[PDB]
Amino acid sequence: DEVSALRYRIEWRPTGAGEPARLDGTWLVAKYAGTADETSTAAREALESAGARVRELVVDARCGRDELAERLRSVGEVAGVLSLLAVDEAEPEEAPLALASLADTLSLVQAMVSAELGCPLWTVTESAVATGPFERVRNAAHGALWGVGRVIALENPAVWGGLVDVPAGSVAELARHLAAVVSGGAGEDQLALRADGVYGRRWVRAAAPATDDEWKPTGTVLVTGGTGGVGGQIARWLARRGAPHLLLVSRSGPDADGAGELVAELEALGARTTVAACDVTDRESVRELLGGIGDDVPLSAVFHAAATLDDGTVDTLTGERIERASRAKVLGARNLHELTRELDLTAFVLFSSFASAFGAPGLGGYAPGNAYLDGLAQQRRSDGLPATAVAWGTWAGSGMAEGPVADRFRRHGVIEMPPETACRALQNALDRAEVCPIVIDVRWDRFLLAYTAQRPTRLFDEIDDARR
Numbered sequence: 220d221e222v223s224a225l226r227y228r229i230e231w232r233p234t235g236a237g238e239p240a241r242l243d244g245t246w247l248v249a250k251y252a253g254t255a256d257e258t259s260t261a262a263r264e265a266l267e268s269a270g271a272r273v274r275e276l277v278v279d280a281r282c283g284r285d286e287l288a289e290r291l292r293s294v295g296e297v298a299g300v301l302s303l304l305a306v307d308e309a310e311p312e313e314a315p316l317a318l319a320s321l322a323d324t325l326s327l328v329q330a331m332v333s334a335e336l337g338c339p340l341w342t343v344t345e346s347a348v349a350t351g352p353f354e355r356v357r358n359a360a361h362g363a364l365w366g367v368g369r370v371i372a373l374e375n376p377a378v379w380g381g382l383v384d385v386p387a388g389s390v391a392e393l394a395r396h397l398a399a400v401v402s403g404g405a406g407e408d409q410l411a412l413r414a415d416g417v418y419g420r421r422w423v424r425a426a427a428p429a430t431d432d433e434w435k436p437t438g439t440v441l442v443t444g445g446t447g448g449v450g451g452q453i454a455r456w457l458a459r460r461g462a463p464h465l466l467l468v469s470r471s472g473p474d475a476d477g478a479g480e481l482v483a484e485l486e487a488l489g490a491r492t493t494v495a496a497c498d499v500t501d502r503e504s505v506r507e508l509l510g511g512i513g514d515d516v517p518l519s520a521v522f523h524a525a526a527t528l529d530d531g532t533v534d535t536l537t538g539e540r541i542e543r544a545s546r547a548k549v550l551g552a553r554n555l556h557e558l559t560r561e562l563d564l565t566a567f568v569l570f571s572s573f574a575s576a577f578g579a580p581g582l583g584g585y586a587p588g589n590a591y592l593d594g595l596a597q598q599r600r601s602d603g604l605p606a607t608a609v610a611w612g613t614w615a616g617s618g619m620a621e622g623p624v625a626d627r628f629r630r631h632g633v634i635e636m637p638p639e640t641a642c643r644a645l646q647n648a649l650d651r652a653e654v655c656p657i658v659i660d661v662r663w664d665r666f667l668l669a670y671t672a673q674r675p676t677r678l679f680d681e682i683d684d685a686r687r
């Protein structure tokens with residue numbers, strides 16, 4: 220089954236370090252002024268009890284890489300740095316990726332590289348991930364740290380220690396495992412600490428939709444980025460599924476290239492299609508769009524494919540840059556979320572990416588926005604609302620023209636999927652109500668060699684094909 224070999228999901232399996240062998244040297248604890256004091260004290264005593272001197276580094280919000288580079292050069296020799304920037308962090312207004320902890324995490328990493336400390340950075344987050352459906356993601360933006368983090372580990376393994384999540388407001392777990400985590404031979408760099416043990420992030424193959432639950436499109440289905448490559452294939456699938464009415468949105472709208480043939484193609488499949496110009500980053504524009512939907516054909520589902528790729532190295536990335544470039548995906552999602560929350564939707568699908576599922580060099584700026592969607596989908600489900608964040612691999616029938624990039628991808632273990640097949644995996648994911656399904660064609664032989672090129676990983680320990 221070509222549709223069952225593309226299905227994966229993220230699970231958190233119990234695990235441990237493996238003899239911490241205590242510590243040795245001085246450790247720096249990065250934190251904002253008068254913030255995460257309780258957690259800092261916990262980390263200090265924990266690290267010190269392991270035989271290591273602990274000094275703190277008070278960071279000024281959005282200070283920049285330069286300031287931190289000068290300061291890290293006078294600190295002397297450092298064994299490692301523990302970041303608490305994302306701990307006890309407020310969740311005010313502005314854009315979600317405007318988070319100070321994201322901007323400063325990048326600055327600390329860049330600063331450590333320039334100062335040439337030669338030590339790894341370990342970042343702590345609070346309820347940024349969920350080990351199970353019963354746990355709620357506190358702020359979906361904190362997941363962006365995990366998304367960019369996975370890329371940084373691939374681009375500069377020496378400076379990146381790993382990511383550790385703990386229950387918000389709790390310091391017990393950290394004080395008990397931090398020592399082993401930072402000095403373990405397991406190689407775990409993506410962990411979640413809970414009152415009931417330590418868990419590691421793992422990829423696992425998904426089963427099959429052995430349920431009578433079959434998602435069907437009704438009323439009006441809205442597709443953002445509907446006139447784009449992937450959006451257009453989704454629209455075709457919906458039409459073939461029997462969708463009565465389709466609303467395709469993009470900034471270009473009717474002026475989109477190929478829009479005419481798309482509409483004709485969709486209606487030729489038996490679906491009244493409408494194409495409108497609408498910038499999903501404009502709150503009022505979206506509202507007016509939703510208020511324009513007929514009463515006889517109420518909105519039943521949203522497919523958010525709107526986005527823009529960036530491409531760039533971590534050394535050239537900044538919190539500001541990332542927030543700016545991913546507005547359509549992030550603000551579009553947040554806007555659609557808050558404006559349709561009261562509607563009786565049967566499906567709310569966010570288009571994530573392999574960029575956040577495992578990450579890859581070059582996509583450090585793209586990974587953050589995709590990770591935000593993953594968390595936002597989990598939060599909706601925790602609140603009793605429908606949501607699916609699909610982490611897509613590459614697509615074959617889309618606008619991927621290729622020159623240097625596609626060829627490198629395929630010999631790296633990632634093959635583009637036929638559009639029709641990708642959509643059928645989505646259908647199966649909906650039928651089983653999977654919150655964050657991963658749909659990608661990966662050839663593990665070639666993949667593992669390219670992924671573990673210069674850094675070991677346990678992410679795929681439960682993958683049979685990756686096991687062999």
Ligand SMILES: NC(=O)C1=CN([C@@H]2O[C@H](COP(=O)(O)OP(=O)(O)OC[C@@H]3O[C@@H](n4cnc5c(N)ncnc54)[C@H](OP(=O)(O)O)[C@@H]3O)[C@@H](O)[C@H]2O)C=CC1
Nearest residue numbers: 444447448449469470471472475498499525526547570571
């Ligand atoms: N193709 C690939 O290699 C990969 C794709 N994927 C997945 O596929 C998804 C779909 O995107 P894809 O088709 O590949 O990309 P495309 O860039 O081909 O873009 C669709 C386009 O979407 C629309 N859009 C952009 N900004 C806005 C906005 N503010 N409001 C409304 N619509 C907007 C626009 O339509 P218009 O011009 O009409 O304004 C835009 O031109 C991704 O988001 C990702 O989840 C993941 C990995 C790789």
